[PDB]
Amino acid sequence: MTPLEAFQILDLRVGRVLRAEPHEKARKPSYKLWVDLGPLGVKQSSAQITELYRPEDLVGRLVVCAVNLGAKRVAGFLSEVLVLGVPDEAGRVVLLAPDREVPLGGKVF
Amino acid sequence: MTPLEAFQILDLRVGRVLRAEPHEKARKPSYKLWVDLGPLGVKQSSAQITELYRPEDLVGRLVVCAVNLGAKRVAGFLSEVLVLGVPDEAGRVVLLAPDREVPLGGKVF
């Protein structure tokens, strides 16, 4: 109930995309992603980051994800974590990332 | 209480550092920061990012902050928002940032 508590409860981690594929089944343009979160292992995610990013661009890049939320299904694909982004002027999702390379599974603070 | 709700309550925004100065009064090394959060205006923050970043580098840089947590005093300096980062192998803070420029005050999702 307290924004300070929510910050404490929410768990944000640095992960690296290992696999990105078109989420054809989904009505809303997205990608099926497989994210390496180090200690947390691999977690799936359906991200609507098709504008600005090509699956080939995602593979191997660092991303920051909300990991402890409940997993949900998207067009059959199970999305266990949320890849964080922010919209540009046109509303397109711009991904967040660490300034440089860092250990996977690292927690944001 | 629910990570999903913590997600919804926590307010993460992108801001631009316009001023950075040595927070020498603070015990733990930090910088006094003034962040332009667009519609939210200017918010102060004490950030322990002295290793890897020099005040000159921070000025004009996009950063991502936790904005709706209560403000806290740090060596007299009022820290109103949290500038988010992640530790490298050495534990040093690495700032998070959008891949490219985006509107200030933009909300992370």
- Measured between beta carbons, the chain B residues lying within 8 angstroms of A66 are 3, 7
- Measured between beta carbons, the chain A residues lying within 8 angstroms of B109 are 84-87
Q: List all residues 6 or more positions away from A107 whose beta carbon is below 8 Å from its beta carbon.
A: A11, A12, A13, B86, B87
Distance CA B34, CA B22 (A): 12
Burial tier of A15 (Cβ tally within 10 Å: 0-12, 13-18, 19+):
buried
Q: Which amino acid is it at A83? A: V
- Measured between beta carbons, the chain A residues lying within 8 angstroms of B3 are 9-11, 66, 68-70
Residues linked to residue B77 through DSSP beta bridges, in sequence order? B74
State whether residue A1 is helix, strand or coil: coil
Residue from B45, B41, B108 nearest B74 by CA: B45
Encoded tokens for A41:
């292992």
DSSP A61: -
Residue from A79, A81, A78 nearest A68 by CA: A81
DSSP A18: E
Phi, psi values for residue A68, rounded to 5°: -80, 15
* Residue in the block written with tokens 């078109």: A22
Instruction: Identify whether the C-beta of residue A42 lies closer than 8 Å to the C-beta of residue A71.
Output: no
Can you give the residue range of the structural domain that contains A8? 1-109
State whether residue A52 is helix, strand or coil: coil
Residue B56 has a CB neighbour count (10 Å cut-off) of 8
Give me the DSSP letters along B41-90: -EEEEEE---SS--HHHHTT-EEEEE-SSPPEEETTEEE-SEEPEEE-TT
What resolution in angstrom units was achieved for this structure? 2.0
Distance CA A28, CA A74 (A): 10
Q: Cβ separation of A103 and B82 shorter than 8 Å?
A: no
Alpha helices in chain A (DSSP H): 3-9, 55-58
Query: How wide is the angle at C-alpha A65 spanned by C-alphas A108 and A87, nearest 5°?
Result: 100
DSSP A6: H
Distance CA B95, CA A98 (A): 6
Residue B22 has a CB neighbour count (10 Å cut-off) of 12
Burial tier of A31 (Cβ tally within 10 Å: 0-12, 13-18, 19+):
buried
CATH code for the domain of A15: 2.40.50.140
A102 shares contact with chain B (CB less than 8 Å): yes
Contacts across the A-B interface (CB distance below 8 Å): 118
Phi, psi values for residue B6, rounded to 5°: -65, -40
Distance CA B32, CA B34 (A): 7
Encoded tokens for A16:
């690296």
Encoded tokens for B103:
């509107």
Query: How wide is the angle at C-alpha A61 spanned by C-alphas A46 and A68, nearest 5°?
Result: 45
Return left, alpha or beta for B70; rule: phi > 0 is left, psi -120 to 50 is alpha, else beta: beta
Interface test with A, best of B10, B48, B49, B80 (most A CBs within 10 A): B10
Burial tier of B5 (Cβ tally within 10 Å: 0-12, 13-18, 19+):
middle
Q: What experiment produced this structure?
A: X-ray
Query: How wide is the angle at C-alpha A15 spanned by C-alphas A10 and A18, nearest 5°?
Result: 140
Interface test with B, best of A7, A53, A64 (most B CBs within 10 A): A7
Distance CA B31, CA A12 (A): 24
Residue A40 has a CB neighbour count (10 Å cut-off) of 18
Q: Which amino acid is it at A43? A: K
Domain count, chain A: 1
- Measured between beta carbons, the chain A residues lying within 8 angstroms of B52 are 99
**Of the partner residues B4, B10, B89, the one whose CB lies closest to the CB of residue A3:** B10
